[PDB]
Structure formats: C-alpha cells, structure tokens
C-alpha cells in the first residue's frame with residue numbers, strides 16, 4: 001500500500017525516469033519484461049535474506065584477493081573487537097590464515113577480560129577498519145589485497161573482529177519490506193509515406209532498404225523511386241527483396257535509410273521482422289527515425305522517442321497468411337537439421353581444414369570446405385565454432401537448421417571463445433544463448449573485469465527480455481559489488497534516448513531485488529546532485545574572482561546543513577568498499593582546467609589513515625574513454641601479476657555517473673612531473689641541473705636506504721606505462737599528464753586520446769625518466785637494460801592475451817566512442833600487439849621500435 005507507492009517514487013527518482021512513463025507506452029513487451037523480471041529479482045531477494053552469515057559476507061563483502069591467488073615473512077597486525085576502543089598488536093606470518101589471527105585475538109581477549117570465552121574463531125570475520133571489506137576464508141594473509149598492499153607500503157594492517165550475530169543483524173536490517181517454411185514468395189513491403197522530413201527542396205528523397213542478420217546482408221539492398229523533397233513525401237510503392245519469406249532467419253532486421261540526392265544523409269530506422277513472441281510482423285508500422293550524424297544495421301530496432309520532431313516513415317508489412325505465423329519451435333528446427341551427409345575427405349583435405357580452423361578472412365573454396373566438414377568441426381575443433389558460424393548461409397533456412405542441430409550438442413567453450421560470440425557478428429538468439437551458457441562459469445572477479453563490455457552488448461540486443469539481461473541481473477543480485485557497478489554503468493547512460501528505456505527497466509528490476517541497495521544508491525545520487533550544483537557555482541565564480549575567493553565561497557556553500565548532510569556518510573560510487581565519511585571542507589578545492597573539476601577530501605576516524613580519501617567530480621566531459629583506458633591498464637596489471645610480474649601500476653578509479661559527469665579517484669601523495677620540474681627555489685628538491693629535479697624530489701621523499709626501493713618502483717611503473725601507452729596508442733603525453741607518487745611509482749592521467757587517434761603512435765622513452773632509472777648516472781647499462789627486460793617481459797605477456805584485448809575492444813564498439821567506431825581502430829591493437837607474427841618476429845619488431853625510441857630519446861641526451 002503506502003510502502004509500495006513510496007518505493008515506486010524512490011525508484012523513479014533514482015533511475016531518473018518516472019515509472020508512470022513505462023505504463024504510458026501501453027507496450028506488451030515492456031509490461032511482460034517488467035512482470036517477469038520483477039518476479040525473477042524478488043526471488044533472488046528471498047534467497048538472499050535467508051543466506052547463512054558466511055554466504056551473506058560473500059554477497060555483501062566479496063573477497064578481494066591478489067590476481068596470483070585466484071582459483072615465510074613476519075607481519076605486525078592490529079586487531080580490535082567491535083565497539084571497543086582497546087586494540088591488540090601482534091606478530092603473525094604472511095603464510096598464516098585469518099582463523100589463526102582470530103584465535104590469537106580471542107586468546108588475548110580471554111586473558112584481558114579474565115574469562116575462558118565460549119566464542120570460537122569460526123564465529124568471526126575480520127573487517128578492514130572503517131571499510132566495507134572483510135578478510136575470511138582459508139587463504140594465507142598475503143593472498144588478500146589489503147594485506148599485500150600493507151606489506152608493500154610498510155603500513156600495519158588494522159582489523160576488527162566481527163561476530164556472526166553482528167553480520168546476521170546486517171543481513172536482517174537490509175531485508176526487502178514484507179508454417180513459415182511453406183511461404184516461398186519473395187519478402188516484400190509497401191513504403192507508404194514520410195512525415196516531418198527536413199531537406200533541401202532542390203533535391204530528391206530516396207529510401208534505401210536492406211535485410212540484415214547482424215552486419216551481414218541477407219540479400220541485395222533495394223531503393224525506392226526518387227521523389228521531390230517535401231515535409232510529407234508519398235511513395236505508396238512495393239519494395240521486393242531477393243529472399244523468400246521461408247528463408248528469413250529468426251533475428252532478421254529490416255533496415256532503412258532516408259536520404260536526399262542531387263549524397264545527403266537524413267535519417268535511419270530499423271525493426272525486427274519477428275516480434276518478441278516469435279510472430280512474423282504484419283500490418284502498418286510508423287517508424288520514428290533517428291537522425292543521421294547509409295544503412296545502419298547495428299542501430300537500435302526501437303523507434304526514436306522524440307515523436308514531435310523526428311522524421312517518420314510509414315510502411316506496410318503484408319499479411320502473408322490468413323492465420324498468424326510464428327518462427328518454428330526448436331523441436332521443428334532440430335528435426336529438419338538432423339538430416340545431412342557427413343563430410344568424407346582425403347588426408348590432404350583434413351590437413352587443409354586443420355590449417356584454416358587453427359589459423360581470419362577466408363576465400364570461397366575455404367568457406368565451402370569448412371561448411372562441408374562442419375561435423376568434424378564439432379567433434380574435433382569445437383573452439384572453431386565462430387568460424388563455422390561465419391561460413392553458415394543465414395539466408396537459407398535448411399543451412400540454419402543444420403547449423404542449429406550442431407549448436408544444440410556443441411560442447412561448452414572457454415570464456416575467451418564465448419566473449420567473441422557476444423559480438424554483433426553473431427546475431428542468432430540460440431548462438432547468444434549458447435554464449436551466455438559458456439559464460440556462466442565466469443568467476444565474480446572475471447565478470448567484474450568484463451562488466452563494462454557486457455553492459456555495452458545490451459545495446460545490440462533485439463528484444464528487452466533476453467538471456468544476457470537475466471544473467472547480469474542474477475549475477476548483480478548475488479554480488480553487491482557487481483550490482484553497484486551494473487547500476488552505475490546503466491544509470492550513467494539514462495540521458496541517451498536510444499537506451500533510456502532498456503536501461504531504466506533493468507535498473508527498476510534490480511531495485512525490486514534490493515530495496516536496501518536502492519536506498520544506498522539514492523544517498524550516492526543525492527551527493528552527486530549537490531556536487532553538480534557546487535561545480536556550477538565554481539564554474540561561474542572562477543570567471544569573476546580570484547581562486548582564494550571562489551574557494552572560500554565553495555567552502556561556505558559546503559558548510560550549509562543540506563550540503564554537509566548530502567556529501568557525508570556515503571559509499572563511494574568509485575568503490576563501494578570505500579566509505580566517504582566526514583567531508584573535510586577545509587581541504588576541498590577545484591582544479592584549474594576548463595571544467596573546473598572539484599577536488600573533494602574525506603576523513604574517517606574509524607578507518608584512521610585509510611579513511612583519508614579523495615574524489616574528483618568532473619562535469620562537462622565524457623569520461624567513458626578514460627574509464628575504458630584505465631580498465632584496460634588494470635587488466636594488463638592483472639595479466640602481468642598472474643605471471644608473477646608486478647609493475648607497480650596505479651589504475652585509479654574513473655566512473656561516468658551521468659551526462660558528461662563522473663568521478664575520478666584521488667591518488668594522494670602524488671604530484672605531476674610538470675610541477676616537480678618547475679624546480680622552485682628553497683625546496684628540498686631544488687637542483688643544479690633541471691635533469692636532477694625528479695631524482696632530487698624522490699630523494700627528499702625517500703631519504704637514506706629507502707631511495708633504492710623508490711628508484712625500483714619508478715623503473716617498474718615506467719616500464720608498465722611505456723608498454724601500456726604504446727599498446728593502446730595513448731598519445732598527447734606531456735609533463736602535465738604524467739604523475740609520480742612519493743613511493744616512486746609513475747602513472748599517467750587524463751586519457752584524452754587512444755588507438756593513435758589517425759597516426760601510428762611510436763614507443764616513447766623520455767630522457768628525464770631514463771635519468772632516474774640510471775640512478776642519475778650518464779652511463780648505467782646495467783640498470784637501463786634491466787628496464788628494457790621489464791618492457792619486453794610486459795609486452796610478451798600482453799601478446800599472449802592478444803585475443804582477449806581484441807574481443808573486449810570488439811564488444812566496446814557498441815559504446816559508440818568516436819575513437820573506437822570502426823575496424824581501423826581495432827587494427828591499431830592488432831599492429832601494436834603484432835598478432836600476425838611469431839613471438840620471435842614480434843619481439844624483434846618491438847626491439848626495433850624500442851631502439852627507435854631510444855635514438856629519439858638520445859637527441860635530448862646529446863644536449
């Protein structure tokens with residue numbers, strides 16, 4: 001009653017779209033999606049509320065383990081018990097498990113409190129002080145990201161013993177409240193008229209129409225007659241296609257482009273020929289067209305919601321039968337596909353097939369041999385499914401039936417293979433369903449790693465209710481960190497009309513599954529709303545007065561009760577494990593670039609030093625490409641660490657949250673190379689030669705024996721970023737967008753341009769950095785060549801995972817980023833990783849690029 005109405009208003013506010021707008025569409029596909037997904041998500045919520053206390057820790061605080069640990073040394077730890085000011089500091093080993101640490105804390109408590117405690121270490125979990133992060137399970141302490149981080153920074157781990165009854169209290173508080181194949185005639189449509197068309201009156205209007213199965217044409221395109229430009233053009237003509245109705249695949253899309261000719265593009269529109277209930281569409285359709293920025297098959301199959309201004313195309317789908325017609329059921333397809341001749345070939349033809357399947361464009365005879373030998377592909381080359389799918393004639397229903405017969409007994413494939421199958425190049429729904437089935441084995445860590453790409457794939461989906469949406473919702477409702485990022489990736493695109501409906505519906509369903517998480521996300525949205533209002537003030541004030549004046553006025557605005565309340569006590573959108581407790585107004589400011597990004601600092605007495613965290617709020621720029629670049633850098637770091645190579649990278653958080661809005665994580669104790677190289681007087685870093693500035697700064701932050709470790713951190717991170725920027729073609733690199741941590745770690749910021757966007761970005765070696773690597777010496781081949789060895793090792797590891805980067809970037813094409821919109825952009829990655837070459841050929845090639853970059857660096861060393 002009253003609670004259902006309040007929850008509806010809270011979802012509406014959170015997702016940025018009134019739920020009443022869904023009802024107003026009177027769309028059965030929307031209605032069925034809402035009902036089915038609410039039931040699915042409420043079932044997941046019921047399962048969650050009865051989880052055991054350890055399972056509930058797995059849901060809410062999923063373990064953050066080191067990449068080498070997934071699937072010796074002395075350490076001091078500080079441990080306290082919940083709600084007690086008193087703590088215990090003790091020595092443990094990096095190889096010890098949390099249970100031994102907890103048993104030690106319990107024996108310590110029993111001696112102090114003078115009682116032989118009933119509590120066993122099995123009744124507890126260790127919280128990282130003031131963070132939503134826990135250590136539990138049968139893992140050595142150094143396997144935990146928190147401990148491994150402390151061990152490298154030299155800091156003492158601070159942990160809280162939390163009893164099972166306290167974890168159960170958290171679970172309880174967080175509860176939700178109480179026949180086609182007989183139709184041989186050619187497919188045809190009637191193009192009736194156009195409405196609200198805007199073009200040059202001197203020209204003529206033409207409608208180009210094509211039938212597609214993904215990117216592939218099902219037959220040649222057909223064009224209407226040229227008619228004179230006017231607001232309401234009238235064609236009333238039949239467009240006939242070179243394909244029988246019986247041969248239309250299930251996922252066939254009819255694509256239109258309206259243009260003006262003397263070519264002047266105007267608009268485009270697509271639609272699925274079968275509806276969500278597998279019925280062949282008949283009757284009139286008014287297609288509200290999307291403005292053209294000619295045929296766009298990857299474009300959405302839903303009409304433009306701006307019906308007041310959009311050009312409209314009115315078409316007629318003829319009634320092909322006196323009764324409704326549905327795509328044949330799976331049982332009928334398999335029955336037809338069951339029949340076929342097994343391929344019989346010579347020992348040479350078997351060697352010919354093995355060659356092409358293990359090799360990826362083919363010639364016609366190569367395609368025919370693959371299709372002929374399809375049974376052998378299934379039985380002995382199952383990972384070559386994608387090749388067989390690409391040779392299948394999707395315009396012949398018998399060939400499709402034969403392919404589906406094999407797909408239905410195809411063995412599950414590795415994750416890497418399934419990622420390729422999510423591409424728009426594989427539009428069939430059974431293929432889509434097969435790909436998801438092979439992705440069910442993704443660990444939560446892998447899923448989190450590829451979540452951004454899986455969300456982009458939703459933009460290629462033809463219908464609202466789909467296996468990918470159910471999969472993501474199911475995984476999000478079983479892991480709070482996944483749920484957090486799924487919400488933000490969808491929410492940050494609500495201002496995009498082509499996805500607002502789909503994304504709004506998914507976010508509503510998720511909210512049905514966790515009323516409590518909806519409220520936690522609302523608190524984050526309230527802080528972002530205040531940051532946007534504050535940033536607008538800063539933008540205006542910065543153009544009228546001095547920075548100390550704008551900063552004092554920013555502080556006065558933040559000190560208002562409504563701002564102090566909204567900006568405090570939230571989970572960070574960048575990392576829900578990070579708690580943003582007390583906003584430190586005195587330390588807040590803004591940066592001097594065009595959009596005046598805000599620099600917001602927080603503190604938390606419960607987290608101690610670890611509670612000192614910062615966020616950058618930036619409004620005016622699209623942060624999606626920065627996020628993708630940083631996530632690709634983070635992936636390189638994981639892949640290197642899995643081979644035991646830690647290049648001390650800094651993949652700081654970057655999250656779009658709204659229209660040209662997002663957050664960026666602050667890396668404290670860091671400064672830009674430009675600021676350090678200003679070589680200011682009366683500073684500990686001041687130098688005789690500007691080349692000494694960076695090394696002098698590192699020496700001032702790392703006195704005595706600590707200097708050596710800082711130079712090594714610099715060398716390792718420099719190698720990681722040299723390789724990362726070269727592979728990704730990160731350009732426009734200068735002293736203002738390269739930073740250094742006091743630890744010595746170098747890192748890059750502000751990823752404006754990548755994939756050479758178009759010019760081939762060469763490998764870069766900067767003399768100032770070569771100088772630090774060489775410990776300030778002019779000649780130090782021992783250190784310089786160790787650094788070259790790190791670059792080579794890093795590069796060879798990435799090449800081995802070359803296909804993973806290609807498959808992920810291929811899926812990213814769905815995002816519509818201007819620097820990742822075609823094959824040329826992905827060709828850049830193929831060249832940088834030299835994937836066509838042997839490891840020896842690619843290493844020789846990299847060596848030539850590294851040596852070319854050294855000679856270029858030496859043009860500075862000569863000076």
Ligand SMILES: COc1ncc(-c2cc3c(c(OCCN4CCC(C(C)(C)O)CC4)c2)COC3)cc1NS(C)(=O)=O
Nearest residue numbers: 589590591593597599626652664665666667749750751
């Ligand atoms: C996508 O856009 C960006 N991407 C990343 C960053 C970024 C990230 C990080 C850091 C940064 O520091 C910039 C140095 N410095 C910090 C302190 C500032 C003081 C408090 C004194 O005003 C003075 C500037 C900057 C540090 O940790 C991580 C900034 C931008 N946007 S921009 C270029 O318009 O600023």
